[PDB]
Amino acid sequence: AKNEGTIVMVSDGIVRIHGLADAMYGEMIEFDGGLFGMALNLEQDSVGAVVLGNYLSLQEGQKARCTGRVLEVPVGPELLGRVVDALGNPIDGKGPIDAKLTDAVEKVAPGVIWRQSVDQPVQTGYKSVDTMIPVGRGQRELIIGDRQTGKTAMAIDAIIAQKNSGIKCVYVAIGQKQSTIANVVRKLEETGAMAYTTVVAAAAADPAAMQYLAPYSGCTMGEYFRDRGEDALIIYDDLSKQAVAYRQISLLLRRPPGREAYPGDVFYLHSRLLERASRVSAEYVEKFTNGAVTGKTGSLTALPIIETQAGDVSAFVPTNVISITDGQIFLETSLFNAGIRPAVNAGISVSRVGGSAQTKIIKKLSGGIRTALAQYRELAAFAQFASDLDEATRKQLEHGQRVTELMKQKQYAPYSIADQAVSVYASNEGYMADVEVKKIVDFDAALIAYFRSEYAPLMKQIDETGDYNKDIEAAIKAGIESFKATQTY
Amino acid sequence: SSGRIIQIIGAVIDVEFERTSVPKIYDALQVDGTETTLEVQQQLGDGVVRTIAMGSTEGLKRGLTVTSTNAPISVPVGTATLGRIMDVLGRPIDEAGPVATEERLPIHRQAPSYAEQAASTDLLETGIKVIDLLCPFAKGGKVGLFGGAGVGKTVNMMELINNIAKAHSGLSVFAGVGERTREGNDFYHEMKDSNVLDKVAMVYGQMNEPPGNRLRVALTGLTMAEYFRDEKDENGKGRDVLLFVDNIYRYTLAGTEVSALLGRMPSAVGYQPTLAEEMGVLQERITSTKSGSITSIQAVYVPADDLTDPSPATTFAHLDATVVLSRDIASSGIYPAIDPLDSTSRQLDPLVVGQEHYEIARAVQNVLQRYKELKDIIAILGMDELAEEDKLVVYRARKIQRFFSQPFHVAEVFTGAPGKLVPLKETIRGFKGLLAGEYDHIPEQAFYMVGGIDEVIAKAEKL
Amino acid sequence: SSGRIIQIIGAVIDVEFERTSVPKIYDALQVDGTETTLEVQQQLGDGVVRTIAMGSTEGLKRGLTVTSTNAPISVPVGTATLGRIMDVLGRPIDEAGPVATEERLPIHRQAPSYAEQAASTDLLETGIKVIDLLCPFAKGGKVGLFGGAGVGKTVNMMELINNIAKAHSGLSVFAGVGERTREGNDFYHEMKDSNVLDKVAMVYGQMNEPPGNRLRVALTGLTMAEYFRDEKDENGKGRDVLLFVDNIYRYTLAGTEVSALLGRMPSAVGYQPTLAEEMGVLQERITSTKSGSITSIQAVYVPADDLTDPSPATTFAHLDATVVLSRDIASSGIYPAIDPLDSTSRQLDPLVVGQEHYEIARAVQNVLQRYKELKDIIAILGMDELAEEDKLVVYRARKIQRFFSQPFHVAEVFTGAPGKLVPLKETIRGFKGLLAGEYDHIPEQAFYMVGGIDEVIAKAEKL
Ligand SMILES: Nc1ncnc2c1ncn2[C@@H]1O[C@H](COP(=O)(O)OP(=O)(O)OP(=O)(O)O)[C@@H](O)[C@H]1O
Ligand SMILES: Nc1ncnc2c1ncn2[C@@H]1O[C@H](COP(=O)(O)OP(=O)(O)O)[C@@H](O)[C@H]1O
Ligand SMILES: [Mg+2]
Ligand SMILES: [Mg+2]
């Protein structure tokens, strides 16, 4: 009698159950037809639950039972190269998934004493991000901008650039139409990056509960690797749509709304999810595996995505995510329409980890880029009055324009650290000051192609080690000066 | 058994049944002694359901009798619906007898799964300069037109129908959701004057109808298009389908009009809390699968000229090509008033359209952005102090926005000038010549309402 | 004598007690079989109270038994809490065994009455020349430290801890109100690496904890600081105690969260009606009394860079000083990286700070302003106009800007832990001499990383 109940009301995906005196918070509930629910409201006389399937087949008078369980998803190195829904059920039609372990969807972050500082780098392949806004293993960096600015391109390029670094990736899609998901999956399979990637899909036609619960299951799938001495990288494509689904669910349950009709605990919703990404110490790994893994640390990096309305970053939702995360990458519509691609705005983009998450050579080299861009920024007003300006100011304008032209890049063309090092070193010493503002991209591409074509051992050494000494600098200068003449663009 | 009406408020009615005969969620009921049909929405307990009438509720009283049908609303499908006009319930309204088929399909169904999805891999030309250059279409994709009141959505839709649907080899479905009756009559007589009435089917629910009809009228046309998509012939392949929807915004507006009477709490600016879910449920059905393809064009209304409003903002993510119309361009006499700095398409990448097209589009957009940047300093200060390159940019940008105007075939009544059709090769030639600087001596008046660059040369010489 | 749960909605729990035994406001309750804690907030009649969970709530059901401890939340206090890390309930989370003490105090207390206020106003020396001259500190006052986007604020806090300790241990207390876990770990590790861990008690409230912890961690830290303040030595006088809260803004954010959860009508922007009440009641316990004093250094994060929002407007009536940091100066090589022009203080009254102090500070600020204005004219024209005028200001403000540099004791990467804790008199004398012109001829590049005038003189005679 304490584990039985009758349905009373059915509307909009919410079911009210009479009875179930032993139901817990978040407990799974089974229905007659094979559908599952989840208790969220424990009132004095009834229970309000959301349906994890489709509710159109449920009618009043049926029976429900409490299972004494919580939400769980399969985990392990078998979901790689697969597409599953929010509950781990495959949807690509490639047969059943044979997993050996399951883990809870709601979990707590590791303690403060079990953590470690972040000093390992993560490469995204973009010159602009890597040399000015570096990202380390265990960091939380936000990508924020307007519609049709290129957030998904940046995330997918970051995923693709992990071909040789050997870190697993997870892609979560919330509230998208299935054609875009299929296109993204096809592009991932084309480049060979599907062998170490998992996709969790919650499309626009799915119930709001699945769209609300998908990121936590993705986070558990990512945490599987962190708890055993490896590294992982998770990406949420839209937290705004998750917030919208949560708002719909909260409003349908008659909870008091606040600013912009959002509930009171949206900040809790995003914070208790984003706090689960960090780096753990070797003692934690030793204790978790009971001595199976001895001398390795684990990490989990997060790349959430937030979309603003007409560049209004003072709304209710984006401010919480901005405050929670460490750094932010801002993309602007005016820069995108003006040809600057990617559209990173260096004025208000920061990385609190800073140079501690960089290789030695890039750390030594990025200072010139930083100072040149700052000096160019210092004279924005008089760009249209070049006739009335100091000659030194004119030269600073020239060098800033050259750097701004250099910072451009194409799509699906990631750069290894050697390419960025060569280009930045060529820019720093003034070899690029004798060409016009145009043809800079052609010059860069030609130089990089030449260096990769005839200087294989040096490129391999820089890629695999990342050291910087007098011999390396001399060899790089010799190659650059050999390209400067006796060659064409 | 049968229930009885216990309360009516506007378009929302609730009925009380016995505890053992409560209908399902999306069932259809009939009121005895009347031509009124009700569709269940919610189950409130104690054998009480809440429904929405599909007609006027005048003359309805508490205590009438209602009988159930134990099925959703079913409409006819097949070739018998070609050349006929039907309402939301599938009844003929063209005074031409009954529909001559027997197959029926429910209007409520689930969307196709993830495994049965296809990739559009074909371009589609239109003859419109700006759309061809800056927002190419794809065969089997989705297109949307965004604009305020009185900016040219209907005219552009009609011109697209004239350019594409006439030279088509297939079928078509046209759905009218909350539009003018005069436009529907004009379109019907225009199609009947020619001999293309045998390839189209029409469903009409307009702005004079109760919210119940406007709520569910798009699903009927969607069901007809779905049946035509998944249709095969013995030793005969499938057929391509064109679908046209007018003001899909009225569907969400009708959903808004009844949200409060159903017992929900408002969100955002007075909107229903289930906006995105009920938009996506309908949007995921308009798609092309492995078995058959659908090409669709929709018109999206922007309330109060606010692109930030929740409805268009939610709609933006369901389309492949987006065309945005602006009142500022329209008020300057430039038609079609398409904003070139806010129109995008997924086909605009060098791997699909080639290098030259991509470079031309990027250069044009860059020039327009630079002119928009310079506008303020040009306005408040003078023009003499500008750099010479800035003057060249200003002149080139003004000529560029002049050259994007084009006289349409369906707009001959308004202006009296014959329409023009431009292949995209001439457009690319003209824009490349314009950006190169070959036409720096032509006055900017010669670029207004012409076809190719040859017409520009002729008009300039005649001047 | 025990109650049972009757309702669980979010983090709000309703417990039904007997009519006679109803726990008072702010009582602490413990569930029987679990390890969760609840705090009473209201009484609703018929033996029903509304509580809040002190942690996670998953794993609870209606019908569990709850017992009352007849007392508010009590935490350990004393010297035994030094060098440890504790949560909002005072339990150790550093894996080092239990805290060895038996003195317990409630975290809910009344502010000191009107007579207990200190009968004088005094200042507090820190060691940093720029913050000792341009932004004087107040003994027992509050410091509003804003500014900084990616700069090293935490190392500055640690160096402030070491500087005050070198002046006088003071038994500082750190309370991170909603701090990043990695930043907290870094702070603890770096304090451990500098042996300053023996004089600091730490309370941590993480970002992912329920908002009640985010509110109450500050109360726990304040209670510990008060107990340290009320400890008297052989002379009979109390200690001066330093308190650190990572962000006051997060405190008000959590207060708004909790108030919105409990179903209250929002305010003009959307905060709670009791913002000023809670902020004042918290802030009225941070005072200097007859025996001992309590100071407060707190980071400020302006909401949306607006000074008209209620969030900083409520706090501005309590901050006794303002300090800002500059990203460019941090990138310019000057380690302290404090912007002088933005950073000001209310303690610059010439009667209390000294007339010479006032004159020197104002003159130095005006000279720096003259340096600031000259850069635009230099960029436009150059120094052709500026001959025998405004150049002297250029060199003087060059050495003035270089003089704010100071090597830092805790930091060992760029210096070997130099003292550099010069008294105020040295700084005022040096600034007076530099303004007068005796050091005008001294090279400007000898002013980098110098503590006193004798040191820069030794440098100048060295080069
Ligand atoms: N570096 C680049 N160079 C050129 N084109 C690019 C670049 N990055 C992105 N694009 C193009 O910009 C367009 C928008 O990219 P994308 O789909 O990633 O944006 P988004 O912000 O995810 O969009 P949405 O508003 O649909 O969420 C696409 O056509 C893409 O090909
Ligand atoms: N190409 C054009 N040439 C001349 N007039 C046009 C053109 N396009 C639109 N218009 C004018 O704009 C008005 C709005 O057209 P229509 O699309 O029917 O209304 P709405 O934009 O509200 O749907 C029409 O009355 C028509 O006169
Ligand atoms: Mg996207
Ligand atoms: Mg219109």
XYZ file of N, CA and C and ligand atoms in Angstrom, chain A residues 147-153 336 341 409-411, chain B residues 346 358, ligand 1:
73
model
N 23.761 34.936 -31.920
C 23.393 33.879 -32.851
C 24.192 33.996 -34.143
N 24.572 32.842 -34.695
C 25.297 32.761 -35.964
C 26.627 33.512 -35.898
N 27.394 33.246 -34.836
C 28.715 33.838 -34.675
C 29.853 32.828 -34.720
N 29.574 31.539 -34.527
C 30.592 30.517 -34.680
C 31.039 29.834 -33.402
N 30.122 29.657 -32.450
C 30.456 28.945 -31.219
C 30.629 27.453 -31.477
N 29.690 26.858 -32.216
C 29.757 25.430 -32.500
C 30.999 25.088 -33.307
N 31.387 25.966 -34.234
C 32.604 25.732 -35.004
C 33.823 25.675 -34.095
N 32.603 39.697 -36.971
C 32.317 38.601 -37.890
C 31.917 39.126 -39.264
N 37.659 36.459 -38.795
C 37.148 35.122 -38.524
C 38.282 34.224 -38.041
N 42.103 33.011 -39.434
C 42.271 31.587 -39.691
C 41.013 31.052 -40.366
N 41.165 29.919 -41.051
C 40.064 29.257 -41.734
C 39.379 28.266 -40.791
N 38.500 27.434 -41.342
C 37.735 26.460 -40.579
C 38.174 25.044 -40.934
N 23.278 28.084 -44.868
C 24.269 27.042 -44.625
C 25.026 26.652 -45.886
N 32.050 32.706 -53.146
C 32.326 33.004 -51.745
C 33.095 34.312 -51.601
N 36.497 30.516 -39.034
C 35.452 30.567 -39.864
N 35.660 30.971 -41.137
C 34.620 31.024 -41.972
N 33.341 30.725 -41.734
C 33.163 30.329 -40.470
C 34.137 30.222 -39.492
N 33.588 29.780 -38.298
C 32.316 29.632 -38.578
N 31.988 29.947 -39.871
C 30.665 29.883 -40.483
O 29.787 30.701 -39.738
C 28.457 30.135 -39.758
C 27.933 30.004 -38.348
O 28.685 28.988 -37.651
P 28.022 28.108 -36.519
O 26.958 27.237 -37.058
O 29.135 27.376 -35.770
O 27.422 29.183 -35.518
P 26.549 29.167 -34.187
O 26.893 30.277 -33.277
O 26.660 27.764 -33.591
O 25.083 29.310 -34.768
P 23.569 29.218 -34.284
O 23.108 30.676 -34.192
O 22.766 28.395 -35.232
O 23.654 28.630 -32.877
C 28.551 28.829 -40.548
O 28.110 29.010 -41.889
C 30.042 28.489 -40.478
O 30.472 27.739 -41.607
